[PDB]
DNA sequence: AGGACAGCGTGTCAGCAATA
RNA sequence: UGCUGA
């Protein structure tokens, strides 16, 4: 049920200068794909630093066995094989997909904006591998440092 | 001190105003009449459309009505009103207006039948009128045009008239905005055209599925106008 | 002191406020502090006599008619409210101006108007 | 025959008021009330069911009038 | 040679005024420049124009440009004779300083037999009808006013009034009792239409 | 008929004492 | 008429 998987590395910890309290906006950049990631992460729970790697996955289900998710949260669920190889899991919805600006050029790149309650992420890169996304679609953002 | 004095004057100003404009109510024929029937306005705001309801009929608020289209039709107008609407009388009027304004880009150019029969101007100035004076003050060359036009033209097929006729009168004037669908103001339909053209060219590059068509958005806006009346 | 060499009736001083626009900054305006509409008609080639404006509303109503004084009334009320950020909807000023100018003249909204 | 087909808000208000003042004066309720003691709630219940035999007589500014039925009037 | 500029402006304005009333005027007269006006025509008796009406070819109008800066009763009679003999009914007297006050009630005294009308020369230097704020006026026909009164269930009184001395009722030559349609270019509704009874 | 002028006008909102 | 409250 994965829509995207990659190994990023943090390049900038907060360039814009807007600074929130417990949230930090990481500007990463993929390896072997040259995809770009802007990611608001709660750093009180999950400290992140510069020059740090992490395996990042976006999914539509946590079960990794096909069964869809029901949209209800039970902390009592008896299926416990949901992806737990990951330290930081989020859960948001994609709210904007916008093909890149360049006209007269191939420019078949897409920017997918995901909201995780209030923590935004933007995945930018070749459209070929951002097809699984679509506006109003719920997705999980699993992460695991390396 | 200024507060006290200002309020003292404002109270009197408002009392006078309220004591003169109090009997003006909108009638069942949409005309603003006084107590004795004297017509003050033939349409309230010059288009009807009381103020509080015209807040979202501004452009720049259509991308909101378009996004929330399903809720707006279910919650208010519903599929019932959209299909109980017949827009032909008003739609044809706007087509006529558009054709006219297409044939006359400059609407301050002195249209006239005889004025339209000044294209022979060169035909006359070449050789015909070269010999005269200002007979009765008009010209030596104007009299040739008067003679050629006056009775040396067809009886009923000298129809330079149609090429020079008035713009159809505005729709709200002829087609009763309340009971007539699609009869809106000339400044609203321009906005709706502009937005439909700038919205059919956004759906093309949208990466989100839109299940609304330009001609359902048009009916939505026309109903939302007809109901803010 | 009250002996004046020569003056246009009603005009006390002119002045050219160089710029009035950013969109088409090239605009120039010949503002005045008096009011004589006909004594400007002679300069239809120096100045634009369409776009002529005055705050008098009785002089406009005498040189251009009452349907032209309606809009001066509306614009005057709007510009009076604008200096404070207030903004009354045009549908109200339209009705006030249509009632004031109902019977062909600019009639006051006061004890002699009733 | 030429006025608007819908029921203006002032007409709804006056029709509800009159139907309520009638119900309160012991008039038969054609709406099958279900335990409510307010005559205005009953009048709204009747207006929603399209059971009000009243004739709105819209007056034009010259004395001419048009008689509409409360049933034949689009309540928004 | 500023007298010629004034004469040319007044003649252009009177040609526009005669075209707006529905008289047969050619494009060249309405688009005549100064260099060609002065080429054609110096005087103030060969500026007199005689114009015909679209319909009713007998119905023509005659524009005067008196020499006397202050026209009087005798000046009025001298060309009321011209009108009576040439068999015309309407006239238009452009005066340079005014009319002596008795003359204004004489022009009024001449019954529909010979209806005249005066215009100051400073009133014709520009076409007020071409101002931004002045809407378009249209004299309604006797069969459109009836349909208006029937549609709105009106009476002819109980309608807004336009003064008979209004600078745009004097220009369009509208007699009393006539209703004029007015197309206001409105920023709110585009092309609002109003009606005013001339009185 | 150029004035001189005498002549009407209004003025947000409720309480208490107290006294005509 | 002197006070007072928005």
Token pair 């506006």: residue? A135
Contact of C52 with E131, CB cutoff 8 Å: yes
- With H, G, I as helix, E, B as strand and everything else as coil, classify residue C79: helix
Query: Residue E180 is encoded by which pair of tokens?
Result: 């004029």
Among residues A124, A108, A104, which one has the least CA distance to residue A33? A124
CATH top-level class of A4-146: mainly beta
Kindly compute the dihedral angle of the four CA atoms of residues B111, B113, B116, B120, in this order, to the nearest 10 degrees.
-160
Among residues E191, E198, E148, E152, which one has the least CA distance to residue E172? E198
Question: How far C19 CA lies from chain B's nearest CA (Å)?
Answer: 29
Domain map (residue ranges) of chain E: 1-126, 127-199
Token pair 């059971």: residue? D51
For an interface test with D, the pick among B23, B24, B28, B84 (most D C-beta atoms closer than 10 Å) comes out as B28
Among residues B47, B57, B80, which one has the least CA distance to residue B177? B47
Query: Residue C6 is encoded by which pair of tokens?
Result: 């020569």
Q: Which nucleotide is nearest to B4 (CA to C1')?
A: F12
Contact of E32 with E54, CB cutoff 8 Å: no
Query: Is B153's Cβ below 8 Å from some Cβ in D?
Result: no
Provide the pairing of β-strand A36-42 with A92-99: unpaired
Nearest CA in chain E to C102: E160
Contact of D18 with D46, CB cutoff 8 Å: no
Q: How far is CA A6 from CA A1, A140, A145, in A?
A: 15, 14, 12
Query: Is D60's Cβ below 8 Å from some Cβ in B?
Result: yes
Q: Quick check: B29 and D62 CB within 8 A? A: no
Terminal-to-terminal C-alpha distance of chain A: 23
Token pair 């011209």: residue? E82
Q: Quick check: A136 and B208 CB within 8 A? A: yes
Q: Quick check: B29 and D60 CB within 8 A? A: yes
Residues 6+ apart with CB under 8 A from C101: C61, C66, C67, C69, C70, C73, C107, E160
Count interface pairs A-B at CB distance under 8 A. 12
Report the distance separating Cα E166 and Cα E196, nearest Å: 12
Contact of A135 with A94, CB cutoff 8 Å: yes
Tell me how the structure was determined: cryo-EM
Kindly compute the dihedral angle of the four CA atoms of residues A59, A65, A67, A70, in this order, to the nearest 10 degrees.
-50
In degrees and rounded to multiples of 5, residue A132 shows phi and psi of -60, -15
Report the distance separating Cα A61 and Cα B164, nearest Å: 70
Report the distance separating Cα C89 and Cα C68, nearest Å: 20
In degrees and rounded to multiples of 5, residue A3 shows phi and psi of -100, -10
The enclosing H or E element of E106 equals: helix E101-109
Query: Residue E74 is encoded by which pair of tokens?
Result: 């005798």
Token pair 């904006």: residue? A113
Judging contacts by C-beta atoms under 8 Å, the chain B residues touching residue C95 are 21, 24, 32, 40-41, 44-45
CATH top-level class of E1-126: alpha beta
B51 touches strand F (CB under 7 A): no
How many Å from the CA of B4 to C1' of G3? 18
Touch C-D: 3+ C-beta pairs under 8 A? no
Nearest CA in chain D to E154: D62
Residues 6+ apart with CB under 8 A from B7: none
Count other Cβ atoms within 10 Å, centred on residue D38: 13
Report the distance separating Cα A137 and Cα B171, nearest Å: 45
Query: Is B14's Cβ below 8 Å from some Cβ in E?
Result: no
Residues 6+ apart with CB under 8 A from E85: none
Strand ranges inside chain B, DSSP E: 25-26, 32-33, 39-41
Report the distance separating Cα B193 and Cα B191, nearest Å: 5
Among residues B163, B162, B181, which one has the least CA distance to residue B171? B181
Domain map (residue ranges) of chain D: 1-76
Among residues A138, A145, A123, A116, which one has the least CA distance to residue A42? A116
In degrees and rounded to multiples of 5, residue E46 shows phi and psi of -105, 15
Q: Which CATH superfamily groups domain E127-199?
A: RPB5-like RNA polymerase subunit (3.90.940.20)
Chain E neighbors (3+ CB pairs < 8 Å): B, C, D
Among residues A121, A35, A139, A24, which one has the least CA distance to residue A83? A139
Residue E57 CA from chain centroid, whole number: 18
Cβ burial, residue E193 (10 Å; 0-12/13-18/19+): buried
Query: Is C36's Cβ below 8 Å from some Cβ in B?
Result: no
CA angle B135, B140, B145 (to 5 degrees): 110
Contact of E181 with E193, CB cutoff 8 Å: yes
CATH top-level class of D1-76: alpha beta
Report the distance separating Cα E6 and Cα E47, nearest Å: 12
Query: Residue A96 is encoded by which pair of tokens?
Result: 């904007």
How many Å from the CA of E161 to C1' of F6? 35
Tell me the residues of chain E between 35 and 74 that have a Cβ less than 8 Å away from chain B. 40-41, 46-52, 54, 57, 63
Judging contacts by C-beta atoms under 8 Å, the chain C residues touching residue B17 are 96, 109
On strand F, nucleotides with any atom < 7 Å from a protein CB are 10-12
Token pair 């208000």: residue? D13
Report the distance separating Cα C74 and Cα C79, nearest Å: 9
Judging contacts by C-beta atoms under 8 Å, the chain E residues touching residue D60 are 153
In window 3-32 of B, residues with CB < 7 A from nucleic chain F are 4, 7-9, 11-12, 15
Contact of A122 with A65, CB cutoff 8 Å: no
Judging contacts by C-beta atoms under 8 Å, the chain E residues touching residue D64 are 153
Residues 6+ apart with CB under 8 A from E64: E48, E79, E91, E92, E93, E94
Count interface pairs B-C at CB distance under 8 A. 39
Q: Which nucleotide is nearest to B14 (CA to C1')?
A: F12
For this experimental structure, what is the resolution in angstroms? 3.0
Token pair 């099958």: residue? D32
Contact of B60 with C106, CB cutoff 8 Å: no
Among residues C22, A4, C40, C38, which one has the least CA distance to residue C30? C40
How many Å from the CA of B11 to C1' of G2? 26
Residues 6+ apart with CB under 8 A from E60: E23, E50, E51, E52, E53, E88, E90
Q: Quick check: B40 and C91 CB within 8 A? A: no
Cβ burial, residue A95 (10 Å; 0-12/13-18/19+): middle
């Amino acid at each position: 049920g994965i829509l995207f998987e990659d190994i990023f590395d943090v390049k900038d910890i907060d360039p814009e200068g807007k600074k929130f309290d417990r949230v930090s906006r990481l500007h990463c950049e993929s390896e072997s794909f040259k995809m770009d990631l802007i990611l608001d992460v709660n750093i009180q729970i999950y400290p992140v630093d510069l020059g740090d790697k992490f395996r990042l996955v976006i999914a539509s289900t946590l079960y990794e066995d096909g069964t869809l998710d029901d949209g209800e949260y039970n902390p009592t669920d008896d299926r416990p094989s949901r992806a737990d190889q990951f330290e930081y899991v989020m859960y948001g919805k994609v709210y904007r997909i916008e093909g890149d600006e360049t006209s007269t050029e191939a420019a078949t790149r897409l920017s997918a904006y995901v909201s995780y309650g209030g923590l935004l992420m933007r995945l930018q890169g070749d459209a070929n591998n951002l097809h699984g996304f679509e506006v109003d679609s719920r997705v999980y953002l699993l992460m695991k440092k390396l | 001190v200024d507060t006290a004095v200002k309020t003292s004057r404002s109270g009197y100003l408002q009392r006078c105003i309220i004591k003169h404009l109090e009997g003006l109510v909108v009638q069942y024929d949409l005309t603003v009449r006084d107590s004795d029937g004297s017509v003050v306005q033939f349409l309230y705001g010059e288009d009807g459309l009381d103020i509080p309801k015209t807040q979202f009929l501004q452009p720049k608020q259509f991308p909101f009505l378009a996004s929330n289209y399903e809720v707006i039709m279910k919650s208010q107008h519903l599929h019932e009103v959209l299909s109980r609407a017949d827009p032909k009388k008003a739609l044809h009027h706007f087509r006529a207006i558009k054709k006219w304004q297409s044939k006359h880009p400059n609407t301050l150019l002195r249209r006239g039948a005889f004025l339209s029969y000044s294209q022979k101007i060169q035909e006359a100035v070449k050789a015909l009128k070269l010999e005269s004076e200002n007979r009765n003050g008009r010209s030596p060359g104007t009299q040739e045009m008067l003679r050629m036009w006056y009775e040396l033209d067809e009886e009923s097929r000298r129809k330079y008239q149609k090429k020079a006729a008035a713009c159809p009168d505005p729709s709200l004037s002829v087609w009763r905005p309340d009971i007539y669908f699609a009869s809106v103001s000339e400044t609203f339909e321009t906005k709706v055209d502009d937005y439909s053209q700038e919205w059919a060219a956004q759906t093309e590059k949208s990466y989100e599925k839109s299940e609304l068509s330009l001609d359902r958005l048009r009916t939505l806006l026309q109903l939302k106008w007809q109901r803010s009346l | 002191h009250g002996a004046v060499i020569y003056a246009t009736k009603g005009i006390t001083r002119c002045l050219l406020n160089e710029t009035t626009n950013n969109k088409n900054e090239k605009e120039l305006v010949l503002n005045t502090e008096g009011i004589n509409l006909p004594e400007l008609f002679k300069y239809a080639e120096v100045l634009d006599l369409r776009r002529l404006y005055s705050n008098d509303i009785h002089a406009i109503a005498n040189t251009y008619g009452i349907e032209a004084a309606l809009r001066v009334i509306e614009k005057e009320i709007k510009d009076v409210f604008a200096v404070y950020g207030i903004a009354v909807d045009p549908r109200h000023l339209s009705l006030v101006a249509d009632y004031m100018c109902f019977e062909g003249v600019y009639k006051p909204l006061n004890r002699f108007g009733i | 025959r030429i006025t608007t087909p819908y029921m203006t808000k002032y007409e709804r208000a006056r029709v509800l008021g009159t139907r309520a003042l009638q119900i309160a004066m012991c008039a038969p309720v054609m709406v099958e009330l279900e335990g409510e003691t307010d005559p205005l709630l009953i009048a709204m219940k009747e207006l929603k069911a399209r059971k009000i035999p009243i004739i709105i007589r819209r007056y034009l500014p010259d004395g001419s009038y048009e008689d509409w039925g409360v049933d034949e009037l689009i309540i928004t | 040679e500023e007298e010629t500029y004034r004469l040319w402006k007044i003649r252009k304005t009177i040609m526009q005024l005669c075209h707006d009333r529905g008289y047969l005027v050619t494009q060249d007269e309405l688009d005549q420049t100064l260099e060609e006006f002065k080429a054609q025509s110096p005087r103030r008796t060969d500026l007199t124009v005689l114009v015909a009406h679209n319909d009713d070819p007998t119905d023509q109008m005659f524009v005067f440009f008196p020499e006397e800066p202050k026209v009087g009763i005798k000046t009025i009679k001298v060309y009321c004779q011209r009108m009576q003999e040439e068999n015309i009914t309407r006239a238009l007297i452009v005066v340079q300083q005014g009319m002596t006050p008795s003359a204004k009630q004489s022009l009024v005294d001449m019954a529909p037999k010979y209806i005249l009308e005066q215009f100051l020369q400073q009133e014709l230097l520009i076409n007020i009808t071409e101002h931004e704020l002045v809407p378009e006026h249209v004299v309604m026909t006797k069969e459109e006013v009836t349909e208006l009164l029937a549609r709105y269930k009106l009476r002819e009184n109980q309608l807004p009034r336009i003064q008979a001395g209004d600078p745009v009722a004097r220009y369009f030559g509208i007699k009393r009792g006539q209703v004029v349609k007015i197309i206001r270019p409105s920023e709110t509704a585009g092309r609002y239409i109003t009606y005013r009874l001339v009185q």
